[PDB]
Scaffold this active site. Sequence first.
Site, PDB file in Angstrom:
ATOM      1  N   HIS B  44       0.912  -1.342  -0.073  1.00 59.57           N
ATOM      2  CA  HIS B  44      -0.016  -0.038   0.042  1.00 59.57           C
ATOM      3  C   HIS B  44       0.660   1.106   0.032  1.00 59.57           C
ATOM      4  CE1 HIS B  44      -1.310  -3.178   2.729  1.00 59.57           C
ATOM      5  NE2 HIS B  44      -1.534  -2.884   2.154  1.00 59.57           N
ATOM      6  N   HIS B  46       1.358   4.931   1.611  1.00 57.28           N
ATOM      7  CA  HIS B  46       0.880   5.452   3.263  1.00 57.28           C
ATOM      8  C   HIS B  46       0.930   6.898   3.290  1.00 57.28           C
ATOM      9  CE1 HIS B  46       0.783   1.255   5.762  1.00 57.28           C
ATOM     10  NE2 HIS B  46       1.042   1.252   4.471  1.00 57.28           N
ATOM     11  N   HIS B  61      -2.831   3.966   5.610  1.00 58.86           N
ATOM     12  CA  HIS B  61      -3.102   3.382   4.295  1.00 58.86           C
ATOM     13  C   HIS B  61      -3.654   5.560   3.947  1.00 58.86           C
ATOM     14  CE1 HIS B  61      -3.584  -1.192   4.768  1.00 58.86           C
ATOM     15  NE2 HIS B  61      -2.386  -0.341   5.501  1.00 58.86           N
ATOM     16  N   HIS B  69     -10.984  -0.056   4.103  1.00 54.82           N
ATOM     17  CA  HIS B  69      -9.728  -1.044   3.504  1.00 54.82           C
ATOM     18  C   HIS B  69     -10.566  -1.878   2.797  1.00 54.82           C
ATOM     19  CE1 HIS B  69      -6.263  -2.671   2.675  1.00 54.82           C
ATOM     20  NE2 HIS B  69      -6.398  -3.594   2.975  1.00 54.82           N
ATOM     21  N   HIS B  78      -9.220   2.340   0.432  1.00 56.64           N
ATOM     22  CA  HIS B  78      -7.931   3.323   0.837  1.00 56.64           C
ATOM     23  C   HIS B  78      -7.241   3.859  -0.766  1.00 56.64           C
ATOM     24  CE1 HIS B  78      -7.989   1.826   4.640  1.00 56.64           C
ATOM     25  NE2 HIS B  78      -9.065   2.545   4.747  1.00 56.64           N
ATOM     26  N   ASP B  81      -4.330   1.100  -1.502  1.00 53.63           N
ATOM     27  CA  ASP B  81      -5.013   0.368  -1.492  1.00 53.63           C
ATOM     28  C   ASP B  81      -4.506  -0.434  -2.599  1.00 53.63           C
ATOM     29  OD1 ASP B  81      -7.471   0.515   1.052  1.00 53.63           O
ATOM     30  OD2 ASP B  81      -5.707   0.493   1.507  1.00 53.63           O
ATOM     31  N   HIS B 118       3.900  -5.276   3.362  1.00 57.00           N
ATOM     32  CA  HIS B 118       4.078  -5.602   4.605  1.00 57.00           C
ATOM     33  C   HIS B 118       4.458  -7.523   4.580  1.00 57.00           C
ATOM     34  CE1 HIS B 118       1.588  -2.742   6.401  1.00 57.00           C
ATOM     35  NE2 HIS B 118       1.405  -2.546   4.683  1.00 57.00           N
ATOM     36  N   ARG B 141       5.327  -3.705   9.014  1.00 58.25           N
ATOM     37  CA  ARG B 141       5.880  -2.900   8.109  1.00 58.25           C
ATOM     38  C   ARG B 141       7.187  -3.680   7.420  1.00 58.25           C
ATOM     39  NH1 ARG B 141       3.021   2.473   8.382  1.00 58.25           N
ATOM     40  NH2 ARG B 141       0.733   1.651   9.562  1.00 58.25           N
TER      41      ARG B 141
HETATM   42 CU   LIG Z   1       0.910  -1.186   4.089  1.00 53.88          CU
HETATM   43 ZN   LIG Z   2      -5.833  -0.131   3.202  1.00 52.86          ZN
END
Ligand SMILES: [Cu+]
Ligand SMILES: [Zn+2]
Lengths: 151, 151
Positions: B44, B46, B61, B69, B78, B81, B118, B141
Amino acid sequence: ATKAVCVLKGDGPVQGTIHFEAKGDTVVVTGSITGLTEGDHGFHVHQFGDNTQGCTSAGPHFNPLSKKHGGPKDEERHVGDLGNVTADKNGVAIVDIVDPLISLSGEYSIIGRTMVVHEKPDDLGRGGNEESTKTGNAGSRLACGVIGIAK
Amino acid sequence: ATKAVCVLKGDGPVQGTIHFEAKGDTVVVTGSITGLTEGDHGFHVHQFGDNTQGCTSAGPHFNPLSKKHGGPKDEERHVGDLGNVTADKNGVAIVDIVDPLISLSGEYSIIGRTMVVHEKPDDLGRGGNEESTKTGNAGSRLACGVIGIAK
Ligand SMILES: [Cu+]
Ligand SMILES: [Zn+2]
Ligand SMILES: [Cu+]
Ligand SMILES: [Zn+2]
């Protein structure tokens, strides 16, 4: 952005965190860089936020007006030309700059570009060789970071 | 920008280089992430390009529309995403995404924001718990980078 931040990193001892704030119609540049040799070190916004080949892929100084290199107070300067930061005997340079050319949005935005601190003093375009008019003879890039949107 | 780039780094084996190209009304995201465990990994944009505290300071995100999400094909998602990247047995994930929500300019611009990969798969807002609805349960992360302007 109204606030931005940059973490300077490289292969050597030099590190720093630079903050940027759109204050009034200007950008206030603050922070510190550690691990430097005493004295001036060229400090510039480079065009690309590209760290794929280290600080090298950052490209030349950010220069949307297509000018020769200068000092921050000069008419003839790159938008990225933030002069020198000065390290003390402990290796610490405190960054304290207000700049009329950089922006955190639009044509002059430095978001997504690269902050670079260099090995040598920037001669502010007054060195008298061709290199002076490009980079101020500031030499190699000790640490750099992509400038990002901050909270 | 019309092109952007991100170098993902973290405190472990995971790293990557992600490229972004504006194409029509989409962003094409290509690249690779190496050093991953085999299988899916949440991926994602951020909110902040802030690496002062490693990948944590990237924030949530990127979510300028205040949505829950989801996966990249969902309406409820998001802006950041981008789903999952999938690592092979050799730990290499090839990133090949076309996304209509992220942009390289304007309000949904991800320039100066942070790409994060992630620890776990992103369940795409379908895990049935509350966390699924925020992060897709993608966990830690592994690596991140500020998305910069590229040539
Ligand atoms: Cu993320
Ligand atoms: Zn998200
Ligand atoms: Cu520079
Ligand atoms: Zn310059």
